[PDB]
Design a binder for this molecule. Structure first.
Ligand SMILES: [Mg+2]
Ligand SMILES: [Mg+2]
Ligand SMILES: [Mg+2]
Ligand SMILES: [Mg+2]
Ligand SMILES: [Mg+2]
Ligand SMILES: [Mg+2]
Ligand SMILES: [Mg+2]
Ligand SMILES: [Mg+2]
Ligand SMILES: [Mg+2]
Ligand SMILES: [Mg+2]
Ligand SMILES: [Mg+2]
Ligand SMILES: [Mg+2]
Ligand SMILES: [Mg+2]
Ligand SMILES: [Mg+2]
Ligand SMILES: [Mg+2]
Ligand SMILES: [Mg+2]
Ligand SMILES: [Mg+2]
Ligand SMILES: [Mg+2]
Ligand SMILES: [Mg+2]
Ligand SMILES: [Mg+2]
Ligand SMILES: [Mg+2]
Ligand SMILES: [Mg+2]
Ligand SMILES: [Mg+2]
Ligand SMILES: [Mg+2]
Ligand SMILES: [Mg+2]
Ligand SMILES: [Mg+2]
Ligand SMILES: [Mg+2]
Ligand SMILES: [Mg+2]
Ligand SMILES: [Mg+2]
Ligand SMILES: [Mg+2]
Ligand SMILES: [Mg+2]
Ligand SMILES: [Zn+2]
Lengths: 155, 206, 127, 78, 60, 98, 24
RNA sequence: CAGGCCUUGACAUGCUAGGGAACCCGGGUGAAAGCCUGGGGUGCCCCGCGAGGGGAGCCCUAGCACAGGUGCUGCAUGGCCGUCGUCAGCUCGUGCCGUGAGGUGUUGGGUUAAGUCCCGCAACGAGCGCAACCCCCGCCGUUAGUUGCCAGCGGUUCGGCCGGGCACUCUAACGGGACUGCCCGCGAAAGCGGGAGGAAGGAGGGGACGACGUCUGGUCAGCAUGGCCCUUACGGCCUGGGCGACACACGUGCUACAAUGCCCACUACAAAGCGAUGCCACCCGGCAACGGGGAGCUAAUCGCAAAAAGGUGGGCCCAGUUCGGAUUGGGGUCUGCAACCCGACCCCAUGAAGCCGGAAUCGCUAGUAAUCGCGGAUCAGCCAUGCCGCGGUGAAUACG
RNA sequence: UCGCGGCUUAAUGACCGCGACCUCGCCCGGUAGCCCUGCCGGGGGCUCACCGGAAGCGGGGACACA
C-alpha cells in the first residue's frame, strides 16, 4: 500500500492452545487452502513432540520461534553506482513472519519424509539451536552486522 | 468504446420496455420474429408520419401495436382507411387480432426519436449541418425541456474527413439513472455516406 | 422453551435451538462430532458457550444447512451467541470483545469478465 | 466405433457388386472417401478423391477393415 | 456469400444435421442463441433498445 | 387445492395483477391464500460487447421470469365467475391448473 | 493426476464415468 | 481450394408473353448438385345442363430491368467497442486582464476516492465528469406461504414421507437501517484520529456506470452504407478436401514433476443453474462407455446430481515410483447419412518427457491469492483444459 | 387536417379570425351478429361496430361493444 497504514488482518485465536503465534504457524504451513490438513499436521507435530521430549506441546515451539527470531536483517537499497545491501533492524511484527516462514521452508526442505515429523525434528533443532531455520537466521544476521558498513542509510 | 445506450441503461427503471409480452423458450424466438417483422414493416413504411416507438404487447392473441406518432394524418387516414389497410397488412404477417392503436405525442419536440429523425430529414434534404443542430436544440428548448444534445456523426457536410458535431443547451445527465433522458437515433442516407443522428432529451428528472 | 437463534455465513445457514439441557449438542439428526467428524476447527463453533462461560447449562439442537463444513461452523459460532443473547440482557455485552455477533459478510466475491476468479487477471504479454 | 452398420455407400457398393460380376474392369472413380473397403469385395483398384485428383489405390487383403479415405492422403509433406 | 446462406438456413430437403441456425436480423452464423434467435450483436442492440421483454442489464 | 400460476417479467405489474386477484377472489366468495412468491428464474446470457475483437471486457444481460402463485382452496362457481371471466393481466401469463 | 483417464480424480476432471468412477 | 454443374439465379418484386396455372408420384444418368423423363391436372373471375372465353393467387419457360458479392476501401462512413482509464478531468456563459494566442474561473495552502468541500481570492455561477439516484451481497421488519422445520398429543409404507401444522431457514416483493448520526481530541471550516451503540462504518463490500477527445485505434467479415470492381462469374448449388497440415518460434492455459502426495472403499457438506421432441430417476444387460424398459417433470414439486476438496480407515514408502498420463496398438459405445483426414467418451495394453525450471516475467491487498469441484452458453456429438458464472477450503504480506 | 391575414417564425411552425371540412350523436334510414330446446327458417331486444341523406352544429383534429 502507499496511502494509508494498511492495518494487519486480525487472526483467529487457536482452539486447543488459545494462542496467536500458533495460528500464524498454521497459516504458514497451510498449502493451497488446506487448513484442516495443516493444523492437523501441527497437532500431529505436537503429538510427536510429547512423544519424544517431555515438554509442553507449545513451549518448544514458542522457544524455537524466539530462538529463530531475527533482529538485524539486510535490505537492498540502490544508492547510486552499486546497489548497497543495507542492514536494518526489524519490527517484531515482521520478525514473527520471517521466523515462521523460515521454519516452514527449512522444515519442508528438512530431509525427513513425513509431514509432521519434519516439523517435529525442525522445531526440536530450532529450539536447540542447530536447525536449518536457525542456520538461516544466523545466515542473515551474518549478512547484516558484517554488512554493517553501509548502515548509515536508515531510509 | 464508451457511452452505453441511454435507453438500455435506464431500461429496468424509469422507462418501460417498448415490447412487453411473455412466453418461455417455446415461443420467444417465434414471437420475436414477428415482433421484429412488424416493426420492419412499420418503421420502413410509417416513417412519413414520423413514428417514435412501437409499443408491442399481447396478453393472449390481442397484439396491441400501439405506436407513438407526432402527426397521425398519414398513419390513420381521412376518417380512417390507412389504419384499416395497415391492420389488414398486420394480419398478413401474424394472424392474430392486431389492434393497432396510434397514439400521438404530447409535444413532438420532447420526443428524441422524432427530433433525431427531423435532423436526419434535414441532412438528407442537404441542409446546413451545424445550423440544423443548433436549430434543433433551440426548437427543443422553445418546446421546453430541461436539456438536449444532438450528436451528429461523421461524413458531415459532404466532407472526407469525418468529424462529429454536436450541440447542447441545458444539462444532459447521462450517468444519472433517475434522469429520464429520452434517446433517439436515425440514420441519414444521403450521397456522401451515412450521417448518424443521435439526440438526447433530458425530460423531468426522478 | 426454545432459546432460538438464527445464523448464516458465506451462504451457509443455521437454525440453532438452544435447549435447557445437560451437556451435549446435536446437528440435523446427526451427532455433533459425527457431523463435523475430525475437523481441527470443529469445536470452534461452540466458542460462544465457552466464553459466555455458560456451557454447563445448555444443550443445542441445530438444523444447519448449506455451504460447507467450516462455513457451517462459523454459522454455529454466530448462532449460539445470537441465540443466547435473545433471552438475556447480560449475555449480550460479551461478544464485542469477541466479534461473536457480526455476520462477517465476506462472501465469495463475484467473478468479473476478463479475469478468472474476480481478481485474478490473466497473464500478460507486454510484447 | 460403428458397430451397427456396414457403412458402405449406395453407389460404391452398387459399383463394386456390379464390377464383381464374374470379373470385370478396374476403373471405379469414387468421390465418397468415407466408405469402407468392402469386406470380401477387395481387388478392384478404386480411384479415391483427396480433392486434387483421383489416386488409384489398388486395394489388397491387408487393407480390408479400413476406410477408403486412408488411401487418398490429402496433404503433401508426409 | 450471405444472401445465399440466410436462405440456405431456411431450406433443408437434405440431411437434418445441416440445420445450423442462422441469425434473424443480421445473418451471422456464430453465437446465435437457442433462446431469441438473434446473434450476440443483434441481441445487444435489441436489448439496449428495449425490443426484448424482460431483458435487462445484469449486475449480481 | 387448485393453483393459479403467474409467470412474466415485470414484477411491478405482476404484483398489481396478483394482489388484484387475491382481492377479487376475496370479494367473490370465501377466502383464498395470498401471493406466494416462489423464486424467480434468471436466464443470464453474456455477449462480447464490441462486434469484432473485444473478448475481454464484455457485457451480460439477465432475464428474470417472476413466478407467483395463488392457491385457490374453495373453487365455487362464484369464484370462477369473477376469476375465469375477469381475467386482466397485461403481459402476464396466467394459467389455472390442478 | 487429472489428465489420466483411469482413476477417480482423473475421471472427475474429465467429467464422465467408468469402471474407475462408477455410477453408485 | 479441387471437380461436377446452374444461369434474371437461393432469392426482392415489376413488365412483354404462346404456355402450365394451386400439385402429387416416380424411372434413368450421377459423387451429389444438375440434367434428361413419364403418370394424375386447379375451387374461383366467370357467361356455366353449352362449346367454352375473358381472366384473379400461385408455378414453370423465353426474355427484360436487375438481383448477388464473406470482392476492395474502417484514413469515405454510420453503428458498436477496446483504449488512455473509474483516470479527475474537459469546458462554457458572463465579467476582468492581455494588441493577441490565451489566461482568470480550475491558482494557493487544507482535504478526500475525486475539480470532494470549505477559507481566501477578478471572479460569480453553470454543463458533461466525480459522488449520489440503480442492482446484488450484508442486518432488521410487514405481507405471503403445495420450499421449510418435532413444538405438540400421535400415526408411523416406520420415511420431511405424511397425519396435526409454517415456528423458523428460505423465497421475492415492499419497507426500515448508516447519516459524521452521537461524543471527545485536532481543525478557519471542510474534515481527520479515536470511542460507543449497531449487524455493518466513515465511498460497509462488489457490480452496472466510463467525461472533452486521442490512438487517421478495431470491425465494409455482425449489420447499414458512399464509391470502385465482378455480372454465364469474384455470383449460385453440390460432392470431396482444407480451415486440424509442421522443419521450428511465440502467447494463453491445462496437467504434471509427488508424500501436505497418489490409489481403492465408505459417509457427509453448496450456490448457481438448465430440461416436452428434452432431463432421464429406478430396474435389467454389459467390468465400463452405454444399451433395452420406464417412473416423474409443462419443473422451489421430477431429473442432470456425482459434488469435489474435506473426513473415515486400508494401501504406497522417496522410488522416475501404485508420481506422471503424453504417446502407440487392440477391443468397443454414442451422436450423426457419414468419425479416414478430424469427434467424444469406455476398456485393456503402452508408460515417454518431466525430479520445481535459464535470462526474464506475470497475477494477487480479504473470502482476495491458492486449491477444489459444479452449472450454463453455443450445441446432434464436440475443442472445453477455453469462456461466462456458482460456491467449498482458505492464507502470507503491505515496513514504505 | 388544409387556403387567407397576422401572432409566431428562417422555410413552418405549436396559434389565432373565417373558410374545405370531418366523424360521434343530439337529425333521419337500411344492412348485419346473438340469447337459443342440441339443426336451420318465421315474432320481440335495438346496435349502428358498417353505410347514404343531414337544419344549426356542442365540439376536437383526421377511429372502433352491444
Ligand atoms: Mg556503480
Ligand atoms: Mg506482521
Ligand atoms: Mg451518385
Ligand atoms: Mg472460488
Ligand atoms: Mg453444428
Ligand atoms: Mg497414476
Ligand atoms: Mg449417495
Ligand atoms: Mg423462362
Ligand atoms: Mg483510399
Ligand atoms: Mg469506427
Ligand atoms: Mg475557458
Ligand atoms: Mg480589450
Ligand atoms: Mg465538480
Ligand atoms: Mg457498502
Ligand atoms: Mg487503421
Ligand atoms: Mg462496401
Ligand atoms: Mg476485409
Ligand atoms: Mg448485411
Ligand atoms: Mg460460390
Ligand atoms: Mg482456426
Ligand atoms: Mg500452461
Ligand atoms: Mg490423486
Ligand atoms: Mg442448462
Ligand atoms: Mg431403456
Ligand atoms: Mg428450476
Ligand atoms: Mg434450489
Ligand atoms: Mg489410448
Ligand atoms: Mg515452477
Ligand atoms: Mg536475472
Ligand atoms: Mg460448466
Ligand atoms: Mg473453441
Ligand atoms: Zn445477429
Amino acid at each position: 500500500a502507499r496511502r494509508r497504514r494498511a492495518e494487519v488482518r486480525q487472526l483467529q485465536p487457536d482452539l486447543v492452545y488459545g494462542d496467536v503465534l500458533v495460528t500464524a504457524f498454521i497459516n504458514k504451513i497451510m498449502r493451497d487452502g488446506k487448513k484442516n490438513l495443516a493444523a492437523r499436521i501441527f497437532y500431529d507435530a505436537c503429538k510427536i513432540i510429547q512423544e519424544k521430549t517431555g515438554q509442553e506441546p507449545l513451549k518448544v515451539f514458542k522457544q524455537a520461534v524466539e530462538n529463530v527470531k531475527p533482529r538485524m536483517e539486510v535490505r537492498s537499497r540502490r544508492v547510486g553506482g552499486a546497489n548497497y545491501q543495507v542492514p536494518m533492524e526489524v519490527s517484531p511484527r515482521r520478525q514473527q513472519s520471517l521466523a515462521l516462514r523460515w521454519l516452514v521452508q527449512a522444515a519442508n526442505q528438512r530431509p525427513e519424509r513425513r509431514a509432521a515429523v519434519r516439523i517435529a525434528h525442525e522445531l526440536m533443532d530450532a529450539a536447540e539451536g542447530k536447525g536449518g531455520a536457525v542456520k538461516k537466521k544466523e545466515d542473515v544476521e551474518r549478512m547484516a552486522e558484517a554488512n554493517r558498513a553501509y548502515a548509515h542509510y536508515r531510509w | 468504446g464508451n457511452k452505453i445506450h441511454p435507453i438500455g441503461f435506464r431500461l429496468g427503471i424509469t422507462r418501460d420496455w417498448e415490447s412487453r409480452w411473455y412466453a418461455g423458450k417455446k415461443q420467444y424466438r417465434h414471437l420475436l420474429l414477428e415482433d421484429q417483422r412488424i416493426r420492419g414493416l412499420l418503421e420502413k413504411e410509417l416513417y412519413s408520419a414520423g413514428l417514435a416507438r412501437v409499443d408491442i404487447e399481447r396478453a393472449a392473441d390481442n397484439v396491441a401495436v400501439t405506436v407513438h406518432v407526432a402527426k397521425p394524418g398519414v398513419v390513420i387516414g381521412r376518417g380512417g382507411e390507412r389504419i384499416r389497410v395497415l391492420r389488414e397488412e398486420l394480419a398478413k404477417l401474424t394472424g392474430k387480432n392486431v389492434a393497432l392503436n396510434v397514439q400521438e405525442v404530447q409535444n413532438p419536440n420532447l420526443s428524441a426519436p422524432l427530433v433525431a429523425q427531423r435532423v436526419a430529414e434535414q441532412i438528407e434534404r442537404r441542409f446546413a449541418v451545424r445550423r440544423a443542430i443548433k436549430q434543433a436544440v433551440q426548437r427543443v428548448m422553445e418546446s421546453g425541456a430541461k436539456g438536449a444534445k444532438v450528436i451528429v456523426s461523421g461524413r458531415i457536410g459532404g466532407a472526407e474527413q469525418a468529424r462529429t458535431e454536436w450541440a447542447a443547451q441545458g444539462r444532459v445527465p447521462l450517468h444519472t439513472l433517475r434522469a429520464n433522458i429520452d434517446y433517439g437515433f436515425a440514420l441519414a442516407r444521403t450521397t456522401y455516406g451515412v450521417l448518424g443522428v443521435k439526440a438526447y432529451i433530458f425530460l423531468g428528472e426522478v | 422453551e426454545q432459546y432460538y437463534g438464527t445464523g448464516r455465513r458465506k451462504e451457509a445457514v443455521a437454525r440453532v435451538f438452544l435447549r435447557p439441557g445437560n451437556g451435549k449438542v446435536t446437528v440435523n439428526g446427526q451427532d455433533f462430532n459425527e457431523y463435523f467428524q475430525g475437523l481441527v476447527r470443529a469445536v470452534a463453533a461452540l466458542e460462544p458457550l465457552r466464553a459466555v462461560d455458560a456451557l454447563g447449562r445448555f444443550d443445542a439442537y441445530i438444523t444447519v444447512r448449506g455451504g460447507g463444513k467450516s462455513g457451517q461452523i462459523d454459522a454455529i459460532k454466530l448462532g449460539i451467541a445470537r441465540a443466547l443473547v435473545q433471552y438475556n440482557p447480560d449475555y449480550r455485552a460479551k461478544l464485542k470483545p469477541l466479534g461473536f455477533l457480526t455476520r462477517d459478510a465476506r462472501v465469495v466475491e463475484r467473478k468479473k469478465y476478463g479475469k478468472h476468479k474476480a481478481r485474478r487477471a490473466p497473464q500478460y504479454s507486454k510484447r | 466405433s460403428l458397430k451397427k452398420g456396414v457403412f458402405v455407400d449406395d453407389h460404391l457398393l452398387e459399383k463394386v457388386l456390379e464390377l464383381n460380376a464374374k470379373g470385370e474392369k478396374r476403373l471405379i472413380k469414387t468421390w465418397s472417401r468415407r466408405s469402407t473397403i468392402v469386406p470380401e469385395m477387395v481387388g478392384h483398384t478404386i480411384a479415391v478423391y483427396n480433392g486434387k485428383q483421383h489416386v488409384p489405390v489398388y486395394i489388397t487383403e491387408n487393407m480390408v477393415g479400413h476406410k477408403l479415405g486412408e488411401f487418398a492422403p490429402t496433404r503433401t509433406y508426409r | 456469400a450471405r444472401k445465399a446462406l440466410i436462405e440456405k438456413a431456411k431450406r433443408t430437403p437434405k440431411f437434418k444435421v445441416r440445420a445450423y441456425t442462422r441469425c434473424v436480423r443480421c445473418g451471422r452464423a456464430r453465437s446465435v442463441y437457442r433462446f431469441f434467435g438473434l446473434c450476440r450483436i443483434c441481441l445487444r442492440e435489441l436489448a439496449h433498445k428495449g425490443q426484448l421483454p424482460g431483458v435487462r442489464k445484469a449486475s449480481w | 387445492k387448485i393453483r393459479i400460476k403467474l409467470r412474466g417479467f415485470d414484477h411491478k405489474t405482476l404484483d398489481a395483477s396478483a394482489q388484484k386477484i387475491v382481492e377479487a377472489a376475496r370479494r367473490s366468495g370465501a377466502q383464498v391464500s395470498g401471493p406466494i412468491p416462489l423464486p424467480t428464474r434468471v436466464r443470464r446470457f453474456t455477449v462480447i460487447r464490441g462486434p469484432f475483437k473485444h473478448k475481454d471486457s464484455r457485457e451480460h444481460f439477465e432475464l428474470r421470469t417472476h413466478n407467483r402463485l395463488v392457491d385457490i382452496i374453495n373453487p365455487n362457481r362464484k369464484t370462477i365467475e369473477q376469476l375465469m371471466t375477469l381475467d386482466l393481466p397485461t403481459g402476464v401469463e396466467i394459467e389455472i391448473k390442478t | 493426476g487429472k489428465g489420466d483417464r483411469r482413476t477417480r480424480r482423473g475421471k472427475i476432471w474429465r467429467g464422465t464415468y467408468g469402471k474407475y468412477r462408477p455410477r453408485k
